[PDB]
Symmetry: C3
Subunit: 389 residues, 3 copies
């Protein structure tokens, strides 16, 4: 009884996964048009817009204060410590993908590197809050420029840090804004179980590589990542993963690390006891530039098509970073990557009917990586963080 009292919200999302599959299998025969499916998955659709709402005011207020609270010279130190984690875990994942196809084996290319550089520096900061640049044959398309806003907020935040007295007001303005948006997420946590159960039920009611990706994704998230945690922190990872259980189950239903960022934040500040100044530093960047989960799913999909190496690995990386939160992101990223090799897009019509579940697993590995990444950073922060205290 005592476990049910405390982990009330946690077990409810566990129950939402069970009852979501149950209701999905209860209404599996579909005599109704996919239009009626959209009207059924509506209580879960509402949950998405509530989270999407809160992304932009959180992701902006988090980085602006996070880099201003931290010393401008020590932030560069901690930054390199965080980048080391990002580049390493990405290298291991792309290496893991090659081994995963060695034993088992079941818009232009240059523009995907030009539009990424173009998105990093936003031409208009308001247009950045809802539009992303992508060269098509206007040029600015729908979906938040989360990369350009993260980049700007990192330099704008650091500029306030180098201002001190005058800059203090703006930092006090964004910290009250970060707390205000985090006080709104307190209610979105309770709508999540009702949402997720109607969200996954509508997504089930609509190929050995499908199992191949899950094999790699679990071996990375349960061996590679926890072993990288135990190596530096010297602390038990399944104690750290236990705290972020509410965030990982939401990622299992959201399929967006950027939309689960508000939950992950409360799953690290409140549950695992991580300093706000370093969750605001690691997590927003990890929700936009992490490749651990996506590159391990994209690259394996880029070798399966060759049946029907250095160049393929770099193109799969700039795919997800070039699509932070764009419409039909997974669909377009796999289309552009096939032009780089030359293989036909006939195989893509098959992956769409199965990506709906695999995109949830890759986000779950990404969310785990951002959380564990923040945890690994904390141990290398202890010298710079005590300096401010």
């Amino acid at each position: 009884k005592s476990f049910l009292r405390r982990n009330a919200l946690l077990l409810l999302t566990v129950l939402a996964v069970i009852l979501g599959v149950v209701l999905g299998f209860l209404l599996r025969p579909y005599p109704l048009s996919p239009r009626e499916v959209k009207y059924f998955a509506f209580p879960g659709e509402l949950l998405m817009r509530m989270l999407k709402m809160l992304i932009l005011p959180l992701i902006v207020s988090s980085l602006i204060t996070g880099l201003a609270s931290l010393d401008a010279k020590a932030s560069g130190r901690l930054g390199m410590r965080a980048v080391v984690y990002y580049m390493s875990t990405t290298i291991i994942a792309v290496v893991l993908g090659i081994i995963l196809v060695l034993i088992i084996h079941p818009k232009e290319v240059l523009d995907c590197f030009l539009d990424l550089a173009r998105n990093i520096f936003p031409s208009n900061l308001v247009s950045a809050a809802f539009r992303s640049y992508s060269t098509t044959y206007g040029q600015e398309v729908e979906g938040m420029n989360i990369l350009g806003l993260v980049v700007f907020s990192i330099v704008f935040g650091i500029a306030l840090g180098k201002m001190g007295e005058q800059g203090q007001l703006l930092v006090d303005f964004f910290n009250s804004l970060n707390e205000a948006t985090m006080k709104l997420v307190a209610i979105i946590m309770w709508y999540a179980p009702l949402g997720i159960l109607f969200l996954i039920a509508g997504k089930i009611v609509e190929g050995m590589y499908m199992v191949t990706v899950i094999v790699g994704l679990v071996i990375h998230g349960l061996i590679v990542l926890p072993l990288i945690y135990f190596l530096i922190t010297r602390k038990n990872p399944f104690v750290f993963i236990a705290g972020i259980l509410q965030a990982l189950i939401t990622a299992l239903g959201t399929s967006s690390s950027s939309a689960t960022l508000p939950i992950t934040f409360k799953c690290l500040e409140e549950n695992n006891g991580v300093d706000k100044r370093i969750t605001r530093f690691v997590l927003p960047v990890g929700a936009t530039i992490n490749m651990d989960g996506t590159a391990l799913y994209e690259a394996v999909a880029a070798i399966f098509i060759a049946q029907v190496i250095i160049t393929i690995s770099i193109t799969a990386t700039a795919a997800s970073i070039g699509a932070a939160g764009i419409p039909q992101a997974g669909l377009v990223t796999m289309v552009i990557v096939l032009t780089a090799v030359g293989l036909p897009t006939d195989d893509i019509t098959l992956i769409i009917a199965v990506d709906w579940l695999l995109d949830r697993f890759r986000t779950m590995v990404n969310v785990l990586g951002d959380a564990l990444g923040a945890g690994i950073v904390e141990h290398l922060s202890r010298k710079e963080l005590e300096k401010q205290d």
Copy 2:
């Protein structure tokens, strides 16, 4: 002479209605293209963009401070007291509409209830400041999401209230912003007479049901509403209506309660002597969810078409709430409501050439309802308001 000195701006808008009809009748024969009509009604067109400008920064700053100044638990009490007024006056109006067709008698349906729930929770708060969602066969169309911004500002404002110390800065930021935008409306008041005279003159230069609606709209605004004021407040209503005379004449020319909201605000705070904390609480919501005036005009138009009950009443309600400030709002709302019954849209081509005057009358009944509603709330506020003082 002494009356002309004080009520200078008031009598000038009275003179604008007279001179506007006079100039309209002076230039009634139209050998000029409707393109030339648009160039003539330009000094009135400019007035609209000046008001439209100020809607968003007022409607956001009003609710955020209004709900933060008030106690988070007492706001829920006052809210229920306000909702009681909204639901009651709407029920009387829809009942009045049935009696008005008993004696005299001269995009999908489900989507109008899905898009309303979708608009309440905005997917992006910046996209909310200029776009509204509406499923069409992109999906987000032009016109402010005033409902989603009102909803967000009510929960964001209440979150600041539950913050106290940290939240104080943001509330001080929006209250200085509410005063700044209200200091800009001081000048827009003087442009209104020159505007309205060229606005109504261009709108006259371009069916017993036309008189039927005015019969119901005046009997509601002069009997139903003032009697609801005298019943609770026990104060003379035509003394309260006298103060809001500058706001009612602007509504007679604007045809938007949301665009007359900046005038109505100064017509209650300065003219009728109503506490800012409860004008900021009632009026913005009344300008977005009031049905007293619109449902009494929409429902009567929904029975006139049947010649050439419970289901018709609920659909006419979600029409205006689903079109807070959308392009050709009255045109699209009557198109979707005819699909729910089945009657042809042939009759709609006739109502457009006469709605231009009837939309001004419905807004006038709405504006009166929001003002009287705020007045009725004040008497039920006296216990909760003295608590803060």
Copy 3:
């Protein structure tokens, strides 16, 4: 050696003009498609979006504080003193253009005056941050409404000034914001040489009137304008022009006074020693309503076409003010001005292949005029500025 140490950034942009023409002439034979030209001028293209980014938060924060710091009654005095400079230098330029075609001689019209009045009062302030109104046969087109934002910020800033105590917080908020965005421009200064050298190199790799315009533009910028400086200030102008050398060379590569505004600001506050309160007052307005450079190039192009007076002068003025920062601004402004006279648009296909260099020269005369204009204002400010101190 000592000159190279101090003027490090200055001589690097001088070197960028040299090496930019050199690299442009090194890669002048073009066997590559204009698509490949766009991929080559990319390190200069990135510089533009970095500046464009910073326009809106600078142009808004500059005017709001600038007019609030200054007395609301004295700002009207200084304003008339600034307007006098704008109207005079524009009259001399349009007169100079008539003399320049006397000795050498080598969407509707009304809508360009209706859309300008429509843009001055923005219908939505968020839509103003990225869209400008222009009647076409939706109605709001891409490109910032810099005029509507300048107009609003001037009245919003003055409203804060007339608020005092309550208004102080918002002014402290925008001044910390002006300093934050100006601390970001410190880095964009160093990217400028690498940018400009790849920006002009890509623009060279793609008619006596071409030389005629440069004759007028230099005689105005080296005689008319410096003589207007020496007449009032009684100080050497080529000492004042020397300080703004980093800003004039950026205008020679940017072709936008609005995008060089962040550099010009640091080129007057730091280099020439001009009071922030009057640079924030003159420069943003000068970057949006100046005609000295553009009207002297547009009007000369409006007489050259007549080969293949009062009405032509007023239409060329409302062209640039109607296109503050719109896509293909110089292309559309010359198209609409030919309809006013009646001459064919066949000559316009020839000016496009040469405007790329002439648009850089007109912006340079505009930037010089805004800087010298601010300098001339300072001497007429000394009484009103010492009053605040």
